[PDB]
Point group: C3
Chain length 256, copies 3
């Protein structure tokens, strides 16, 4: 059996929002220590990887590992079905016919129990994170979201440039162009709005704006975003859950 | 002559919202004791029936009965034309060339008088309400609306099931499935949120979700909804106005 | 060189909203005393004319006159790129390769500098305002916007009628019809909501509702709108900036 109770369905709803642009069929491996999931998109330039730990739940029990594969169109539909504050419970049995999602409320009324038929997906799991990235940075999710959104209207390609104490976002398209230059600093009032940067090697990479627009949906889950860039491997954008994470690996646009 | 003044145009606007999915041509019989109207839809599975009494108005005068038939596309358009708090007045003369809608405001400015050309509709009025329905229930309009809306995303058919002290809404479609089980109780704090049920015979009927989605638009007009279900006749969903009602008769889906 | 700093980008964003329905290519003449611009639409029935004076800015410097022509689709896109309270600065050099738009914020972070490639437009400037219009009136932008919007749903033509102390807006189409009659008065509490009218000659003109809908977008820029109507020339609708204006000249519909 398996029973995992989120204190608030909002968290799972936002996490699943994080997958709008992958293969709508996604495997969720549920183990003794929590849930992991990963999904690639069609073009195979973007990988989404989620880990939710035991303590991110309100309650959690997984007697034996169980892989449940779900259609994210349909799970996303079923996840519109309650107030963000409802306690959401995933329930399954040893070999799962189907996953159960049970919503509960502040009031003692209205049991809302949904089911989702599980699919059979072949699990080709990707371990593509690097040890040392060329540069690491972190900044408020809100700020990163605004930068991406704004620059997205000028061209279909956003270019990240890292030099000593200088982070430069640039969109250069037919109509016009735009640049946003931020620099590291500590804001002692709220260490939230702080901007951190470690640069082992300067970097200059270009990304499809469609995919950055997808990636910034994770702002709903964390105050800060972490960006690891290197010229060799795909770039990593990470939003941290209370004991967990949602990660977006994105391959830079090719030059030719 | 005929002159009927709603204290607030909001009420008539919401009532007319209740007709979005009928023959856009609708007869309004205005009599000494108020207004009645009824409209069937194309497929002829849903009937909408409205009664507004003298006391639901701010003022009312109908010297002689007058039938005024209107295009609800066009009346709906003309009903976007003022603040919800404007005093709205319907005006007509003995044999009506046209209906007049006169908006007035808190401020003494801005007379806004619209007209609508009347059509000739043949009045085939339906008296299809039963004496004894198999089961009767009542519950908050908000709750019924949420249940219908949620379950509507899983299949195109919602199934109502009534057993002793148990009301069960169920949608079972291709992607997944959903169930919502409520039970009767008295909430003394707010007798609003109370859920009432009388069951003379258990019932099990299925309804097109398109039509339940249409029917729940009446939540704007009442705190509670009444549902009379029987296996013989069409089901009745009723929202009560201050001395009036808006009723939706809906024929269950056929089994075959 | 040229450097013009709006205290708040909101103002320029709303001004440019005022041009949604012109030739998307628009000349901006920048002179010692401020900025002027004008744009005709395709059908050539509507002219939009803007003047912004030195004092409407937070800072202003124009060493030599410079004509910069811009695509308003693209400038409108680039103008979504900041908070309404950002200080927006237009920057150019003697013969302009490109215009620069520099956003600055309350916080010392995030330099956001965009560029727009300039086009070559031939400047056929129109001086079509009359000395004496047949009638002049002024009324709250909100009220004019509501009247236009409401009446726009009944027909594609709105008809203005001016008689002694009587202003009458009328839409008369297939579905129904609507009339709105306002009269001059002084409201001493707020001289804003006052309605002023000088009538040298009664007037009766008809206007495409598409174009009135376009014109009312200027409500964002002023509390009041001024309307000069005459039977000879195109009608003038004027919204006043703090030392400036946005004007819409609109030719009446032809009778035939």
């Amino acid at each position: 059996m398996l029973e995992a109770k989120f204190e608030e369905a909002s968290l799972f709803k936002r996490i699943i929002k994080g997958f709008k642009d992958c293969v709508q069929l996604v495997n969720f491996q549920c183990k003794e220590d929590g849930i992991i999931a990963q999904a690639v998109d069609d073009s195979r330039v973007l990988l989404v990887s989620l880990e939710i730990g035991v303590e991110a739940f309100q309650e959690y029990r997984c007697d034996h590992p169980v892989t449940l594969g779900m259609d994210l169109t349909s799970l996303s539909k079923i996840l519109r079905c309650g107030n963000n504050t409802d306690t959401l419970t995933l329930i399954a049995d040893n070999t799962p016919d189907s996953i159960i999602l049970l919503f509960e409320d502040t009031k003692k009324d209205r049991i809302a129990e949904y089911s989702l038929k599980l699919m059979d997906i072949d699990a080709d799991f990707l371990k593509i994170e690097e040890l040392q990235y060329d540069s690491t940075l972190s900044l408020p999710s809100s700020e990163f979201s605004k930068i991406v959104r704004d620059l997205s209207q000028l061209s279909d390609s956003i270019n990240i440039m890292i030099t000593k104490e200088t982070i430069k976002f640039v969109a250069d398209g037919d109509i016009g162009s735009g640049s946003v230059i931020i620099k590291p600093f500590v804001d002692m009032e709220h260490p939230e709005t702080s901007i951190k940067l470690e640069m082992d090697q300067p970097v200059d990479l270009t990304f499809g704006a469609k995919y950055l627009l997808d990636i910034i949906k994770g702002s709903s889950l964390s105050d800060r975003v972490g960006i690891r860039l290197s010229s060799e491997a795909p770039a990593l954008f990470q939003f941290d859950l209370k004991s967990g994470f949602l990660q977006f690996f994105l391959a830079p646009k090719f030059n030719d």
